[PDB]
Amino acid sequence: VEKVFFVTSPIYYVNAAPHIGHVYSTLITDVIGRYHRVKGERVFALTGTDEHGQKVAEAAKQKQVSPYDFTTAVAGEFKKCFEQMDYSIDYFIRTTNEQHKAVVKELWTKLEQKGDIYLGRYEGWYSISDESFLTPQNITDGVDKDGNPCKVSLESGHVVTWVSEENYMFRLSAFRERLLEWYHANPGCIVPEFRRREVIRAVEKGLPDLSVSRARATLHNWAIPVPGNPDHCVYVWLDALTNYLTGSRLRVDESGKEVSLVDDFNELERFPADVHVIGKDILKFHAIYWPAFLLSAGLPLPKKIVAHGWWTKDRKKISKSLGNVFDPVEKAEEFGYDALKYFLLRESGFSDDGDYSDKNMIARLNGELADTLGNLVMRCTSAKINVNGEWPSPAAYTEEDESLIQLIKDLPGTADHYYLIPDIQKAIIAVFDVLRAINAYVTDMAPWKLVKTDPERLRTVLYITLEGVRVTTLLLSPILPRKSVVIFDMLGVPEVHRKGIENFEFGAVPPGTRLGPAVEGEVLFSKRSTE
Ligand code: MET
């Protein structure tokens, strides 16, 4: 199936300003998208904002402002932040969009016509802040904003409230067996593996039916009305999840503005998502509810859901009220955009709750980006070493030459598999393992001495080094999109050879290609003061 590769981030609540969690999720989405574009594939990468619900409307009220104005402003803060982060996302969706509402109504009607929605009751706990229904086993005792006894979510720690309401219910219980068939038949469909096992164990135990509407009053009328019943509003999560379907059906103009909603998803060849990127906090919605809605509606299911962990800073929770902030724009202005991206993607795997510190950030910047990558680029482009400023024609390869060539040839296959899991950390580590071997080869060969001693031998060492740098940089370009261009410029790699699987091959750039011009004080990654 040749198709548009469709990758998504969650759409974020607009109750507060964007922070590291949103930036991270969208980064991962962006990297996956970029990698597939460099493979030469059609890509549609989607992100946005989740703007309805009690959470958002009550946040708007605290600030004493209309929900229309509040959501528009905060959505604007998200757009600005992502523009500043220099992502390459194809569309930013908002759930207040009029075409999104039409798609939600359409999906609801499908579910209803399928016979999977009935009028019932929910009587139980609810976390407004997570917009999540909870069983008694998922709450415990805690303290409220006044310091008084209350109940709180075991999963999030936020305050829970008891809801008793006549609600439209989705027959989620009837999808147990089909969901288990889906997990078993596609054992790569949830990453990482231990989260897949978590989902299966939960669904094995049994699923209750799910409330998919609420009384309009309790939502402060900030939601999508239920088709055919104006007293009810659609559950914010059914509304939210549907953004993936809406996005798959929007034709977007050059300005990034939506201009048209197609009737059928096949028209645009995006749906279903190849990868949904999410935080672990919202796994049940994506791995249980969403596929259940899709099965009911007769829509195809996503290929992969990847769920990552939560960041801390200096081994403590990130929080403004606690005095431990982590502003990614600020840190990117301080250490560099590509460098911060690298750190976030290298420091932690999706299994882990990563930790940022300035100490570790500086260590990775100095050790990997500067000492390993940058130093190598300067060596093979130095006029002291590469005296003719060009890709030389290699002479015969020794066994040591060939062991390195083999590593370079194997790298694209290895990195590719890792990018497709996806496991971005392992893709990076694999590339840097090859960079370290190129460095050690260079140190071993001492090309600087070969200038005087054996110019022929130098041609060989230089060519292998240049090509190793080109291939590694190509595979890092989704992670260091700005710096990869600087490197290719320095190497004089023609535009055409900067993407496409043809250029994963060793030897794509011919001997005789000239290096890019030099600039006196130019430095690729400047080391930062250790303190
Ligand atoms: C359909 S993804 C919705 C995610 C939700 N708005 C959140 O921030 O957790």
CATH number for the domain harbouring residue 165: 2.170.220.10
- Same domain flag for 440 and 428: yes
Helix (H) or strand (E) segment spanning residue 225: strand 225-226
Listed resolution, Å: 2.3
Q: Are 355 and 315 in contact (CB under 8 A)?
A: yes
Q: Note the helical H segments in 249-327.
A: 283-284, 290-297
Q: Are 12 and 49 in contact (CB under 8 A)?
A: yes
- Same domain flag for 362 and 317: no
Measured between alpha carbons, how far is 283 from 295 in angstroms, rounded to an integer? 18
- Same domain flag for 228 and 242: no
Indicate which atom in ligand 1 lies nearest the CA of residue 282.
9
- Same domain flag for 420 and 317: no
Measured between alpha carbons, how far is 91 from 96 in angstroms, rounded to an integer? 15
Rg (C-alpha) for the chain, rounded Å, is 26
Q: Strands across the sheet with 225-226, in order?
A: 213-215, 229-234, 225-226
Measured between alpha carbons, how far is 208 from 176 in angstroms, rounded to an integer? 10
Which residue is closest in CA terms to ligand 1's atom 5? 12
- Same domain flag for 297 and 417: no
46 CB within 6 A, ligand 1: no
Which of these, 115, 168, 119, lies nearest to 298 by C-alpha position? 115
- Same domain flag for 160 and 209: yes
Which residue is closest in CA terms to ligand 1's atom 8? 12
Helix (H) or strand (E) segment spanning residue 33: helix 20-38
- Same domain flag for 201 and 83: no
Which of 20, 50, 52 has most ligand 1 atoms within 8 Å of its beta carbon, as the pocket-test mutant? Answer: 50
Measured between alpha carbons, how far is 428 from 485 in angstroms, rounded to an integer? 18
Question: What are the Cα distances from residue 165, in Å, to 227, 238, 366, 417?
Answer: 18, 18, 58, 48
Measured between alpha carbons, how far is 211 from 168 in angstroms, rounded to an integer? 6
Which of these, 379, 244, 215, 220, lies nearest to 302 by C-alpha position? 244
Out of 341, 356, 371, a domain closes at 356
Indicate which atom in ligand 1 lies nearest the CA of residue 50.
6
- Same domain flag for 192 and 338: no
Question: What are the Cα distances from residue 426, in Å, to 36, 140, 476?
Answer: 17, 38, 12
Indicate which atom in ligand 1 lies nearest the CA of residue 241.
1
β 139-143/149-153 pair status: antiparallel
Question: What are the Cα distances from residue 132, in Å, to 71, 215, 270, 281, 320?
Answer: 21, 16, 29, 11, 24
Question: What are the Cα distances from residue 156, in Å, to 24, 55, 198?
Answer: 19, 15, 17
Which of these, 336, 311, 313, lies nearest to 479 by C-alpha position? 336
Q: Give the residue carrying structure tokens 């803060």.
A: 77
Count how many domains the chain has.
3
53 CB within 6 A, ligand 1: no
- Same domain flag for 262 and 404: no
Q: How many helices (H) and strands (E) does the chain have?
A: 19, 19
Q: Give the residue carrying structure tokens 């050059």.
A: 254
Instruction: State the angle between helix axes of 481-491 and 455-476 in degrees (0 to 180), rounded to the nearest 10.
Output: 160
CA 337 – ligand 1 centroid, Å:
26
Structural biology method used: X-ray
Provide φ and ψ at 374, rounded to 5°: -60, -50
Out of 199, 216, 236, a domain closes at 236
CATH number at residue 17: 3.40.50.620
Measured between alpha carbons, how far is 200 from 194 in angstroms, rounded to an integer? 10
Q: Are 6 and 47 in contact (CB under 8 A)?
A: no
Provide φ and ψ at 264, rounded to 5°: -135, 130
- Same domain flag for 131 and 270: no
- Strand extents, DSSP E, 235-354: 250-252, 258-261, 275-279, 305-308, 312-313
Helix (H) or strand (E) segment spanning residue 141: strand 139-143
Measured between alpha carbons, how far is 442 from 463 in angstroms, rounded to an integer? 11
Which of 8, 9, 13, 294 has most ligand 1 atoms within 8 Å of its beta carbon, as the pocket-test mutant? Answer: 13
- Same domain flag for 85 and 120: no
CATH number at residue 498: 1.10.730.10
CA 298 – ligand 1 centroid, Å:
23
Which of these, 179, 182, 228, lies nearest to 206 by C-alpha position? 179
CA 189 – ligand 1 centroid, Å:
20
Q: Are 45 and 314 in contact (CB under 8 A)?
A: no
238 CB within 6 A, ligand 1: no
CA dihedral sign, ordered 440, 446, 450, 453: negative
277 CB within 6 A, ligand 1: no
Out of 217, 236, 255, a domain closes at 236
Instruction: State the angle between helix axes of 337-347 and 481-491 in degrees (0 to 180), rounded to the nearest 10.
Output: 110
Instruction: Name 329's bridge partners.
Output: none
10 CB within 6 A, ligand 1: yes
Please give the residue range of the domain that contains residue 436: 357-531
Measured between alpha carbons, how far is 159 from 198 in angstroms, rounded to an integer? 24
Secondary structure of residue 292 in the 3-state scheme: helix
Q: Are 242 and 296 in contact (CB under 8 A)?
A: no
Three-state SS annotation for 242-261: CHHHHHHCEEECCCCCEEEE
Provide φ and ψ at 506, rounded to 5°: -65, 130
- Same domain flag for 319 and 364: no
